[PDB]
Design a protein around this ligand. Structure first.
Ligand SMILES: [Zn+2]
Ligand SMILES: [Zn+2]
Length: 497
């Protein structure tokens, strides 16, 4: 019985240690499970079995229990090395390349949301990317590739999931971060070339002339593409001189950067990987001609990629729904998908796709089974909703602090938040506080200030919210899980999977 394991541990340790029944695994003659301490919420690994298995873990022994010969009990902490050995014994706890099947990325800014994300994918065919954070997010939350992957795998171990998952090195720019991500075993690298994306509506004409002249002297794009026709499906696309000049000015050094990154990956990653190229940064929606140019330049240079992240028409602001003409969205999506199949095939990636419910149907029609969708912030928003539900004074303080940090934390993104429409909370009854994580502007304000709240210090050195927030989220674990899981499952449902 499980209850007699809990009683064995309690009598031999003096701690109420409750077993996640879904965590128990049995490989060879050994047993691995997770337990939660109901006093402080800390979680621990427990290994039950032979002499040499239990030896390869850093842990304190609790004695030998009759099993079914006697088996040693070893309680252990989830540091990186114990987790490495656990991934040896439970070999599904390792990230794997996704392929040309559809995928969904549930990024976790907090490191405690993976089991809920697992519950969301239950019953659905859609490759899950469970370890997904950007260099910027990890910079703002004090984490790294290793810690993000370890958190994701700890969550998987809790859930009991034995299926495939992925680890996305989101929005990487410089080769040293790529190298760190290679060392941590990540399976997809989403490379960002924005440092070299050149918005044509900002620069002076002369600078654009100079940049194009350099790129054309170095690569001679004119004689390769000028007046070249591309007959994709019904449509015919012609590289007229002007359109080609502006495509080159916008994307040339960016493609140089992406080639450099892909070559770095060929020279240094022995293990399998796949690659996502991000074109999301352009303010203008990506033209079909620019799509053609980018994919053809990547092919000509030998760059293997699996995911292309176009900047599609419309508005893609964080936390809120897609704004724009749904039928232009539909038609340009037909364009981009039809071109992707002839030039590839490959997957289209929807950066900042969290909560764009209206676009999903169009995406699940033309994109079909070759889609990727990336969500990280919405999980944090649902977590803050749980916080407001159970610690409303904490949410009140966070709300004021966030309204304050908003201006500095938004100058690094791109939103049209209407601060006038943020409800006045001094009147709102603690019961209704969660409901304003339904009002779009408050959604945005909470969304982009996550780093400030998560790292805000006091004078005496204490943290304003971090500790209280994690305590609250631990005390109400299944609440948190249900919220996050049901929202992500809303996503996957509307996406046709
Ligand atoms: Zn560069
Ligand atoms: Zn992006």
């Amino acid at each position: 019985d499980r209850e007699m394991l809990e009683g064995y541990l309690k009598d031999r340790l003096g701690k109420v240690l409750e077993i996640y029944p879904a965590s128990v695994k049995r490989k060879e003659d050994a047993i691995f499970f997770m337990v939660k301490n109901r006093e402080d919420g800390e979680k621990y690994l427990v290994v039950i079995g032979s002499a040499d298995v239990t030896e390869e873990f850093s842990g304190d022994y609790v004695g030998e229990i009759a099993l079914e010969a006697k088996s040693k009990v070893k309680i252990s902490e989830r540091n990186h090395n114990n987790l490495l050995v656990l991934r040896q014994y439970l070999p599904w706890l390792n990230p794997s390349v996704c392929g040309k099947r559809s995928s969904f990325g549930t990024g976790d800014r907090l490191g405690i949301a993976t089991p809920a994300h697992v519950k969301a994918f239950e019953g659905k065919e859609c490759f899950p990317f469970l370890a997904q954070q950007s260099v910027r997010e990890m910079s703002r939350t004090g984490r790294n590739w290793l810690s993000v992957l370890d958190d994701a795998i700890w969550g998987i171990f809790e859930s009991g999931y034995e299926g495939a998952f992925g680890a996305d090195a989101d929005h990487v720019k410089d080769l040293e971060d790529i190298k760190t991500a290679i060392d941590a075993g990540y399976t997809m690298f989403t490379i960002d070339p924005s440092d070299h994306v050149l918005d044509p509506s900002t620069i002076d004409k002369a600078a654009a002339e100079h940049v194009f002249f350099e790129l054309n002297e170095r690569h001679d794009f004119l004689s390769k593409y000028e007046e070249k026709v591309y007959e994709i499906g019904g449509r015919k696309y012609t590289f007229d001189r002007d359109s080609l000049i502006e495509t080159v000015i916008t994307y040339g050094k960016a493609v140089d950067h992406v080639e450099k990154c892909y070559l770095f990956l060929k020279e240094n990653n022995r293990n399998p990987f796949e690659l996502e190229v991000s074109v999301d940064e352009t303010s203008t929606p990506t033209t079909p001609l620019a799509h053609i140019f980018i994919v053809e330049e990547l092919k000509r240079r030998g760059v293997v990629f699996t995911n292309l992240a176009l900047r599609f028409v419309g508005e893609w602001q964080k936390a809120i729904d897609y704004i724009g003409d749904l039928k232009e969205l539909d038609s340009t999506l037909a364009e981009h998908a039809a071109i992707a199949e002839v030039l590839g095939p490959y997957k289209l990636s929807l950066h900042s796709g969290s909560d764009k419910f209206s676009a999903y149907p169009y995406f699940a029609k033309h994109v079909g089974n070759l889609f990727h969708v990336k969500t990280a912030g919405t999980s944090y928003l649902e977590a803050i909703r749980v916080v407001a539900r159970f610690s409303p004074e904490l949410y009140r303080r966070i709300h004021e602090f966030a309204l304050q940090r908003f201006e500095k934390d938004r100058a690094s993104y791109h939103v049209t938040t209407d601060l006038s429409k943020v409800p006045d909370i001094s009147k709102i009854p603690d019961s209704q506080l969660e409901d304003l994580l339904n009002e779009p502007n408050t959604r945005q304000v909470i969304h982009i200030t996550y780093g400030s709240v998560l790292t805000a210090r006091n004078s005496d050195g204490s943290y304003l919210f971090r500790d209280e927030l994690f305590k609250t989220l631990s005390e109400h674990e299944r609440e948190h899980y249900e919220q996050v899981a049901s929202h992500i499952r809303k996503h996957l449902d509307l996406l046709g999977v």
